[PDB]
Design an enzyme around this catalytic site. Structure first.
Site, short mmCIF file in Angstrom:
data_model
loop_
_atom_site.label_atom_id
_atom_site.label_comp_id
_atom_site.label_asym_id
_atom_site.label_seq_id
_atom_site.Cartn_x
_atom_site.Cartn_y
_atom_site.Cartn_z
N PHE A 93 2.66 2.22 -3.32
CA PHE A 93 1.74 2.61 -4.38
C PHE A 93 1.00 3.90 -4.09
CE2 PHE A 93 2.20 -1.95 -5.51
CZ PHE A 93 2.68 -1.76 -6.79
N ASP A 113 -16.38 -7.59 2.23
CA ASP A 113 -16.32 -7.67 0.79
C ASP A 113 -17.52 -6.94 0.20
OD1 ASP A 113 -16.52 -8.87 -2.03
OD2 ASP A 113 -14.75 -9.91 -1.24
N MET A 114 -17.28 -6.20 -0.89
CA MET A 114 -18.35 -5.47 -1.56
C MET A 114 -19.42 -6.40 -2.13
SD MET A 114 -16.39 -4.11 -5.01
CE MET A 114 -14.85 -3.71 -4.18
N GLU A 158 -13.74 -2.03 2.75
CA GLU A 158 -12.48 -2.73 2.54
C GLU A 158 -12.54 -4.17 3.06
OE1 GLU A 158 -9.28 -2.05 0.92
OE2 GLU A 158 -9.30 -4.17 1.47
N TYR A 176 0.83 -1.20 0.00
CA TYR A 176 0.00 0.00 0.00
C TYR A 176 0.87 1.25 0.00
CZ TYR A 176 -4.16 -2.78 1.22
OH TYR A 176 -5.21 -3.68 1.21
N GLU A 218 -7.45 -8.48 -12.07
CA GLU A 218 -7.59 -8.55 -10.62
C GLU A 218 -9.05 -8.61 -10.25
OE1 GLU A 218 -5.21 -5.80 -8.40
OE2 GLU A 218 -3.33 -6.59 -9.20
N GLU A 274 -10.65 1.22 -7.34
CA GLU A 274 -9.41 0.97 -8.08
C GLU A 274 -9.01 -0.49 -7.86
OE1 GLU A 274 -5.00 1.29 -7.83
OE2 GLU A 274 -6.26 -0.20 -8.83
N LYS A 329 -1.98 9.00 -10.22
CA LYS A 329 -3.19 8.20 -10.07
C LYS A 329 -4.24 8.85 -9.17
CE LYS A 329 -4.29 4.60 -7.55
NZ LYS A 329 -3.80 3.50 -6.69
N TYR A 330 -3.79 9.39 -8.04
CA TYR A 330 -4.70 9.95 -7.05
C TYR A 330 -5.18 11.33 -7.45
CZ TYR A 330 -2.93 5.99 -4.39
OH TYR A 330 -2.57 4.73 -3.98
O1 LIG Z 1 2.16 -3.71 -11.91
C1 LIG Z 1 2.30 -3.97 -10.71
N1 LIG Z 1 1.34 -4.51 -9.94
C2 LIG Z 1 -0.03 -4.82 -10.40
C3 LIG Z 1 -1.03 -4.17 -9.44
O2 LIG Z 1 -2.36 -4.27 -9.95
C4 LIG Z 1 -0.68 -2.68 -9.26
N2 LIG Z 1 -1.51 -2.02 -8.24
C5 LIG Z 1 -1.19 -0.59 -8.32
C6 LIG Z 1 -2.03 0.22 -7.35
C7 LIG Z 1 -2.12 -0.40 -6.10
C8 LIG Z 1 -2.64 0.35 -5.04
C9 LIG Z 1 -2.75 -0.21 -3.77
C10 LIG Z 1 -2.34 -1.53 -3.55
C11 LIG Z 1 -1.82 -2.28 -4.61
C12 LIG Z 1 -1.71 -1.73 -5.88
C13 LIG Z 1 -1.17 -2.53 -6.90
C14 LIG Z 1 3.49 -3.71 -10.04
C15 LIG Z 1 4.09 -2.45 -10.14
C16 LIG Z 1 5.28 -2.19 -9.46
N3 LIG Z 1 5.84 -0.98 -9.56
C17 LIG Z 1 7.16 -0.66 -8.97
C18 LIG Z 1 7.00 -0.16 -7.56
O3 LIG Z 1 7.38 1.17 -7.99
C19 LIG Z 1 7.55 0.74 -9.36
N4 LIG Z 1 5.84 -3.15 -8.71
C20 LIG Z 1 5.25 -4.42 -8.61
N5 LIG Z 1 4.05 -4.67 -9.29
C1 LIG Z 2 -5.29 -2.05 -5.65
S1 LIG Z 2 -6.08 -1.71 -4.23
C2 LIG Z 2 -6.40 -0.07 -4.15
C3 LIG Z 2 -6.20 0.41 -2.71
C4 LIG Z 2 -6.38 1.91 -2.48
N1 LIG Z 2 -7.63 2.39 -3.06
C5 LIG Z 2 -5.23 2.69 -3.05
O1 LIG Z 2 -5.33 3.18 -4.20
O2 LIG Z 2 -4.21 2.82 -2.34
C6 LIG Z 2 -7.49 -2.60 -4.18
C7 LIG Z 2 -8.02 -2.69 -2.75
O3 LIG Z 2 -9.38 -3.13 -2.75
C8 LIG Z 2 -9.57 -4.22 -1.85
N2 LIG Z 2 -10.53 -5.16 -2.47
C9 LIG Z 2 -10.30 -5.96 -3.53
N3 LIG Z 2 -11.40 -6.69 -3.84
C10 LIG Z 2 -12.36 -6.36 -2.96
C11 LIG Z 2 -13.77 -6.75 -2.71
N4 LIG Z 2 -14.38 -7.67 -3.49
N5 LIG Z 2 -14.42 -6.16 -1.69
C12 LIG Z 2 -13.83 -5.24 -0.90
N6 LIG Z 2 -12.55 -4.84 -1.07
C13 LIG Z 2 -11.78 -5.35 -2.06
C14 LIG Z 2 -8.21 -4.83 -1.64
O4 LIG Z 2 -8.10 -5.34 -0.32
C15 LIG Z 2 -7.25 -3.68 -1.89
O5 LIG Z 2 -6.91 -3.01 -0.67
#
Ligand SMILES: O=C(NC[C@H](O)CN1CCc2ccccc2C1)c1cc(NC2COC2)ncn1
Ligand SMILES: C[S@@+](CC[C@H](N)C(=O)[O-])C[C@H]1O[C@@H](n2cnc3c(N)ncnc32)[C@H](O)[C@@H]1O
EC number: 2.1.1.320
Lengths: 625, 302
Positions: free
Chosen positions: A315, A407-408, A380, A312, A432, A423, A321-322
């Site tokens: 990222f 879970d949603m 979450e 977390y 995902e 996201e 992104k944000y």
């Molecule tokens: O493409 C990658 N991961 C696929 C995921 O769907 C990316 N998302 C991105 C947004 C996000 C937000 C909160 C929690 C998890 C995530 C993971 C990836 C990229 C990477 N980037 C490096 C860390 O800084 C460059 N490292 C390892 N994996």
């Molecule tokens: C890639 S992350 C984005 C996290 C956050 N919004 C950010 O940008 O830092 C996806 C998040 O959604 C949660 N998530 C994934 N599938 C879910 C579901 N079916 N119901 C609730 N939460 C879920 C995951 O635990 C994860 O923390």
């Protein structure tokens, strides 16, 4: 700084010579381990019984020096593919001898030439050496951009140089390497030392070497133009190639004698250091990406597993992104609530998959931007992050944000939502299980409710990379299918590779999806025009997404969001490499599959040849629901 | 020098009768070379009984007399160098040393005039030298693999031969705008020798131990024989009216052949590679060979 070394074929005193070249600023030295002219007989007397010693003593250098500074060189007379049997057998024995001596010395690398079409026996002898004893040595195949035959001056009256164009014939040098490495079964210990001639060949044959394991580039002193001050430089197009090679972090080898006699030898090197100092400094993306180049990451379980705290954290540092998400909500509010209603209409916003809460704060910053009132739910699944959320909410957000720990797909909502923010995207958009998640959540979105993101689309492009093909191959594990590693996608910052055609859309999803019979399974056929000879090793995956209206995100290289490191590309390998000729079409087929428990991709290549259907049933990889 | 290197590479008789020796160190701590003059041929290869000697920085791949007091040296260092003999003839001093080749200079030959020379290297190039002015007049990249042997024509200054591991035998003529001409897959040509009288005839040995007799104007390979079991290292004609041909190989043997290439003499005297052969200007039946076995042998030819 560049890592670089001096090639030599004459070493009188090993101790002095190494000193002179070290003073010149060279990191290492390429030298012979036996005298280049010292032909040795192994079969027939009396030459067979030549009194030793056969070469220099190992004691002349420190173990460390041998390990770090010396690159061995195969004696040029060793010709395992000679038409003469006697020479063949002698070279065989000679090659083993020399190779073993390199291994004995503990040299990091050892040079060998590819200077003709038939290297079948050379490959055999090398291969056999690789499977004898336990050693770590690397092997550099010296192979030129332009075959020496195709560089010769047009001075043989009765045998002129063919001035006509032969597209394939000008690429013959790559085929020399390709055959050799194929015979050697893609050993991770056999790399390329690419020789760069004075006249660069046409761009297509230069591009052939993309995706190839280039560890070294060789620059003959003779290829260097001289400037008006008498110093060594390179043509504009030679500089081009040097910059490309710089990104590939190759080592540079300077071969030949000083042809600019007025200045010291380090001048050649100084020009490379100058060029290295001159490349454009790394962009925002390349600062975070650096260190991840061609590194494979196995498929992770977005639902079945929970993300660690630091995942977390990393990222959350995304510079785009944000900001983009904030804007997407900002536009949506203004549209949903008119100016005169700015105090009567409070909007219900639901962050689905809130993580540690940045999209919650983005929603709060967007409300104060649009001067509108919002009610927040933060749902979450990850109870660990739900800790952070509830601590954020008690200390800061207060009653405005309701934190929901579930879970949603399961949550029963008090009220329906105006806007659902999420996201849940992978490198391949829907990998995902964003579709599946939001699907089981859209029942608590209002009949006119907006989903952010609104849609996303995956993109595929065929790639060549013998490097990455080798990485995947090395992912074999005990206690599973010995080929399973090929039947799963890998998230990877693709680096040493060659894109063979332009990315084309693969799969698209819309949210909300009010289509009566909701089906997330897909089947797509794609046709990629390929206009170079090459070898196909897989397909790169990217995605684009529409958050709201004209507010978007992309990892698709053409339209890539600036500085956004959050997603690397994905890689879908294929079990066996497929040869592609110029002008041919690569046809790929991708299926999105699912049952009630898991979701997976299946793929196949149908043109120019057929591959096996990959990951059938999800036998190698699935994403759990 | 107090000690001469183990590997004897070349041996050439001057017209006054003295013996020139090129030697390389192809093993051990130091890989270098040395040049030697022996006014007593029978005193060779003994360091104590020599007229002159000098250390070179690197090994000696090939050499030749330039006239009577010049020594032209093909170095491992990728350099061609000229060594001037003393007027006392007790010292040997460097005249020029030019690093112009990119790899080991493997072969040298002096042109008929004696003011120009031709060199062949592993860098695949062939260079033409002005010995007086110490420069490269012409640089020719004609071959596709390393140049094994270059041989200046006996009497024409602009004409010479070359052969390389690219399987090409090139007749040269620097008077043509395209200098080279390909003389016609046999095993790779390794050694060349012009006929010392018939300026249109030459011999070449291949890697398979076969000496062939070639007419330039006919180009239909006249005659060949299986002289050796291994690669033919060198070919030298005798000063005789009807000349004999000395044939040295890596099978550690010498052969002497008539003009129809029949075997007359054979000598196993060497227990390592036979590296050069030079006929005596004084006794025309006396032939001196040097090898890597450090033996200097003198042969009586019937
Ligand atoms: O493409 C990658 N991961 C696929 C995921 O769907 C990316 N998302 C991105 C947004 C996000 C937000 C909160 C929690 C998890 C995530 C993971 C990836 C990229 C990477 N980037 C490096 C860390 O800084 C460059 N490292 C390892 N994996
Ligand atoms: C890639 S992350 C984005 C996290 C956050 N919004 C950010 O940008 O830092 C996806 C998040 O959604 C949660 N998530 C994934 N599938 C879910 C579901 N079916 N119901 C609730 N939460 C879920 C995951 O635990 C994860 O923390």
């Amino acid at each position: 700084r560049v890592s670089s070394g001096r090639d030599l074929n004459c070493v009188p005193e090993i101790a002095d010579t190494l000193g002179a070249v070290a003073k010149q600023g060279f990191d290492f030295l390429c030298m012979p381990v036996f005298h280049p002219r010292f032909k040795r007989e192994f079969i027939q007397e009396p030459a067979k019984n030549r009194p030793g010693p056969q070469t220099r003593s190992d004691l002349l250098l420190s173990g460390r020096d041998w390990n770090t500074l010396i690159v061995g060189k195969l004696s040029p007379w060793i010709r395992p593919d000679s038409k003469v049997e006697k020479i063949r057998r002698n070279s065989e024995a000679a090659m083993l001898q020399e190779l073993n001596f390199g291994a004995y010395l503990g040299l990091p690398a050892f040079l060998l030439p590819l200077n003709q079409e038939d290297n079948t026996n050379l490959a055999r002898v090398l291969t056999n050496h690789i499977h004898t004893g336990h050693h770590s040595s690397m092997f550099w195949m010296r192979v030129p951009l332009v075959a020496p035959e195709d560089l010769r001056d047009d001075i043989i009256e009765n045998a002129p140089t063919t001035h006509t164009e032969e597209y394939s014939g000008e690429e013959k040098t790559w085929m020399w390497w390709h055959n050799f490495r194929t015979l050697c079964d893609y050993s991770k210990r056999i790399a390329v030392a690419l020789e760069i001639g004075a006249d660069l060949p046409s761009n297509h044959v230069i591009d052939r070497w993309l995706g190839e394991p280039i560890k070294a580039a060789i620059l003959p002193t003779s290829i260097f133009l001289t400037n008006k001050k008498g110093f060594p430089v390179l043509s504009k197009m030679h500089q081009r190639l040097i910059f490309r090679l710089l990104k590939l972090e190759v080592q540079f080898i300077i071969t030949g004698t000083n042809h600019h006699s007025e200045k010291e030898f380090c001048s050649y090197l100084q020009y490379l250091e100058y060029l290295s100092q001159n490349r454009p400094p790394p962009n925002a993306y390349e600062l975070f990406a650096k260190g991840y180049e061609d590194y494979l990451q196995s498929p992770l379980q977005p639902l079945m597993d929970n993300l660690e705290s630091q995942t977390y954290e990393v990222f959350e540092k995304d510079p785009i992104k944000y900001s983009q998400y904030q804007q997407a909500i900002y536009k949506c509010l203004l549209d949903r609530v008119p100016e005169e209603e700015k105090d009567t209409n409070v909007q219900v916003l639901m962050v689905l998959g809130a993580g540690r809460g940045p999209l919650v704060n983005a929603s709060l910053r967007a409300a104060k931007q649009a001067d509108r009132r919002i009610k927040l739910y933060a749902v979450e699944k990850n109870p660990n992050a739900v800790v952070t959320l509830e601590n954020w909410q008690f200390e800061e957000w207060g009653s405005q944000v309701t934190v929901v720990s579930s879970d949603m797909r399961e949550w029963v909502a008090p009220e329906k939502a105006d806007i659902i923010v999420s996201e849940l995207l992978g490198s391949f958009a829907d990998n995902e299980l964003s579709p599946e998640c939001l699907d089981g959540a859209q029942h608590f979105l209002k009949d006119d409710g907006v989903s952010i993101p609104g849609e996303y689309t995956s993109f595929l492009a065929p790639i060549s990379s013998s490097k990455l093909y080798n990485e995947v191959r090395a992912c074999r594990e005990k206690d599973r299918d010995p080929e399973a590693q090929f039947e799963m996608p890998y998230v990877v910052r693709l680096h040493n590779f060659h894109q063979l055609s332009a990315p084309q859309p693969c799969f698209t999803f819309s949210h909300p999806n009010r289509d009566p019979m909701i089906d997330n399974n897909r089947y797509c056929t794609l046709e990629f025009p390929v206009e170079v000879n090459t070898v196909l090793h897989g397909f790169a995956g990217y995605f684009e997404t529409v958050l709201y209206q004209d507010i978007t995100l992309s990892i698709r290289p053409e339209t890539h969001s600036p500085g956004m490191f959050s997603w690397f590309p994905i890689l879908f390998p294929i079990k066996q490499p497929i040869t592609v000729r110029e002008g041919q079409t690569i046809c790929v087929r991708f299926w999105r599959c699912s049952n009630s428990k898991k979701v997976w991709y299946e793929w196949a290549v149908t043109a120019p040849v057929c591959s096996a259907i990959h990951n059938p049933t999800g036998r190698s990889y699935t994403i759990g629901l | 020098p107090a000690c001469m290197e183990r590997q004897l590479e070349a041996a050439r008789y001057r017209s006054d009768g003295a013996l020139l020796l090129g030697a390389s160190s192809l093993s051990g701590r130091c890989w270098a070379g040395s040049l030697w003059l022996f006014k007593d041929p029978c005193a060779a290869p003994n360091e104590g009984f020599c007229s002159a000697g000098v250390q070179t920085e690197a090994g000696v791949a090939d050499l030749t007399w330039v006239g009577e007091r010049g020594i032209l040296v093909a170095s491992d260092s990728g350099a061609v160098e000229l060594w001037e003999l003393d007027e006392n003839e007790t010292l040997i001093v460097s005249k020029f040393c030019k690093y112009e080749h990119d790899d080991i200079v493997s072969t040298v030959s002096v042109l008929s005039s004696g003011t120009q020379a031709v060199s062949g290297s592993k860098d695949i190039c062939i260079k033409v030298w002005d010995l007086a002015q110490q420069v490269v007049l012409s640089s020719y990249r004609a071959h596709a693999a390393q140049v094994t042997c270059v041989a200046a024509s006996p009497h024409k200054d602009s004409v010479f031969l070359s052969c390389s591991e690219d399987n090409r035998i090139l007749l040269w003529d620097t008077r043509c705008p395209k200098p080279a001409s390909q003389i016609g897959p046999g095993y790779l040509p390794t050694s060349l020798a012009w006929h010392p009288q018939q300026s249109e005839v030459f011999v070449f040995g291949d890697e398979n131990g076969t000496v062939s007799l070639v007419d330039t104007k006919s180009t239909s390979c006249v005659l060949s024989s299986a002289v050796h079991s291994q690669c033919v290292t060198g070919l030298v004609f005798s000063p005789h009216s009807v000349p004999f041909l000395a044939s040295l190989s890596e099978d550690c043997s010498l052969a002497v052949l008539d003009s129809s290439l029949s075997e007359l003499f054979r000598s196993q005297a060497h227990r390592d590679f036979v590296r050069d052969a030079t006929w005596s200007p004084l006794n025309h039946s006396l032939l001196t060979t040097v090898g890597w076995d450090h033996q200097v042998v003198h042969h009586v030819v019937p």
